Amino acid sequence: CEVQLNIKRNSKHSAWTGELFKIECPVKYCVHRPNVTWCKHNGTIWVPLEVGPQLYTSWEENRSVPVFVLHFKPIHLSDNGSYSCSTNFNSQVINSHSVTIHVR
């Protein structure tokens, strides 16, 4: 068992502006659940994603593997971009592959 963030490589999804939309980060862990955070690429680097009245997170256990979720309520054109999840757990940084969202 090793803590892993399991977004599939090359993940890509499209959404429509104004829809309630979500992206998911499956998390494999061994004993305690890590504090996971979302990041969004700003064109040159990955930066922590700011949440607020229309962007929030949750954990779903209604599955085989727990899933950390980012919910856009609703999603906007400005949300187009590449996202990943990461965690500082124990003594290292664990990262995931990115999911690219294209908003129409």
UniProtKB/Swiss-Prot annotation:
Subcellular location: Cell membrane
Role of this protein: Inhibitory receptor on lymphocytes that negatively regulates antigen receptor signaling via PTPN6/SHP-1 and PTPN11/SHP-2. May interact in cis (on the same cell) or in trans (on other cells) with TNFRSF14. In cis interactions, appears to play an immune regulatory role inhibiting in trans interactions in naive T cells to maintain a resting state. In trans interactions, can predominate during adaptive immune response to provide survival signals to effector T cells.
Glycosylation sites: 35, 42, 62, 80
Extracellular side: 1-104
Domain Ig-like V-type, residue spans: 1-100
Disulfide bonds: 1-30, 25-85, 39-46
Name of the protein in its database record: B- and T-lymphocyte attenuator
Subunit field text: Interacts with tyrosine phosphatases PTPN6/SHP-1 and PTPN11/SHP-2. Interacts with TNFRSF14/HVEM (via cysteine-rich domain 1).
Organism from which the protein derives: Mus musculus (Mouse)
Effect ascribed to mutating residue 5 to H: Loss of interaction with TNFRSF14
Tissue expression: Expressed in splenic T- and B-cells as well as lymph node tissues but very weakly in somatic tissues. Also expressed in macrophages, NK cells and dendritic cells. A polymorphic tissue distribution between several strains is seen.
Disruption outcome: Mice exhibit no developmental defects in T- or B-cells in thymus or bone marrow, but increased antibody responses and sensitivity to antigen-induced 'experimental autoimmune encephalomyelitis'. T-cells lacking Btla show increased proliferation with a heightened response to anti-CD3 and a slightly greater response to stimulation with anti-IgM.
PTM: Phosphorylated on Tyr residues by TNFRSF14 and by antigen receptors cross-linking, both inducing association with PTPN6 and PTPN11. N-glycosylated.
